[PDB]
């Protein structure tokens, strides 16, 4: 159920400000301009990070220029935000490019339609979107299913071959995927560019997880024990005298583990 209170859209919000103007531009123009824009954005981000050795190709296919020093390599492992952004632009760059080709006098409209259809049904095979965000397999699978459905309603009496267009339902799928992800990428890339600008938060504090549960447990335990002993101890002894205590405890634990009775004489 869509929540109703949030009736300040993104575009509306942007419209409200001065820094945007509006124009009537051809969709191809919009596309090409957005490839150019996107390219500039991603390059700006990468260079900002410092790693100029990652050359963006104009086809949004990122690759390193030089052989990478291990440090450099570590630096350049861009995350699932940036790569996902790239992949979406790759997707877009494909279809927009196909339109350009069509309109640039290369290919016929049927050829265009087929091209677009091919792109949508082979987003997996044309842009490793799945790599970064694997739930896109669902989308890919859906597209495949559509193709299977469509073709066999498109090729009843007609034989086999590649020349079917009809890109609608797949296109719908991709739109809904983008709808799904727009929030995710606003968060992800939001945080990313924030990190680029503001440093990362220095109140890191890690949660417990399966991997560090035991260590945390044990530290909590020894803190508790230490506290109790200090409460007990009437002299108000130093932290260095607590080291003896906790070390004693540790030994005791080990003794228990062994099943050797832990009977140190000098204790209270």
């Amino acid at each position: 159920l869509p929540t109703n209170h949030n009736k300040t859209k993104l575009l509306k919000s942007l419209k409200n400000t001065k820094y945007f103007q509006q124009t009537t531009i051809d969709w191809v123009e919009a596309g090409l301009q957005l490839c150019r824009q996107g390219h500039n954005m991603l390059n700006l981000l990468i260079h900002r990070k410092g790693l100029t050795y990652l050359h963006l190709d104009y086809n949004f296919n990122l690759k390193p220029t030089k052989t990478l020093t291990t440090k450099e390599r570590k630096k350049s492992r861009l995350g699932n935000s940036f790569h996902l952004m790239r992949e979406l632009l790759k997707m877009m760059k494909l279809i927009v490019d196909t339109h350009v080709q069509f309109r640039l006098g290369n290919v016929d409209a049927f050829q265009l339609a087929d091209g677009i259809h091919y792109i949508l049904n082979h987003i997996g095979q044309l842009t490793g979107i799945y790599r970064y965000k694997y739930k896109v397999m669902h989308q890919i699978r859906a597209c495949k299913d559509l193709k299977h459905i469509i073709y066999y309603k498109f090729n009843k009496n007609l034989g086999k071959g590649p020349g079917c267009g009809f890109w609608q339902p797949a296109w719908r799928v991709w739109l809904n995927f983008l709808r799904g992800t727009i929030p995710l990428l606003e968060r992800y890339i939001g945080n990313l560019i924030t990190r680029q600008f503001e440093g990362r938060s220095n109140e890191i504090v890690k949660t417990t997880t399966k991997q560090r549960l035991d260590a945390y447990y044990d530290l909590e335990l020894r803190n508790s024990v230490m506290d109790d002993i200090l409460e007990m101890m009437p002299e108000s002894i130093r932290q260095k005298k607590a080291r003896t205590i906790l070390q004693h405890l540790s030994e005791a634990w080990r003794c228990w583990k062994a099943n050797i009775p832990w009977d140190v004489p000098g204790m209270p």
């Binding site: 209170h5 949030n6 993104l10 400000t17 938060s201």
Partner: protein, 100 residues
Amino acid sequence: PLPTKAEIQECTARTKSYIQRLVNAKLANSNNRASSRYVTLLLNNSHHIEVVSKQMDPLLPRFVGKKARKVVAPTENDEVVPVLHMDGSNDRGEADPNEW
């Protein structure tokens, strides 16, 4: 006296107002425009002036200043405060350490 109901209403009003404002501040601060919808003039002498907040481009960072600085806090314990325990144990207090 257990506090007055009327005065509890006061305190609640004050502190509730405060915390609501604080949370609003926290929210409109954050980059997630999603959380903008849960948000519940001056003079610099005898001389007078109008304060304004110019709306900025929603591309450029909202808060250019903040950059996650490490900052050490000065304590500011300007007023001294005692630590004040009343006891004097000699017999049990000296016999015990030999055991402890």
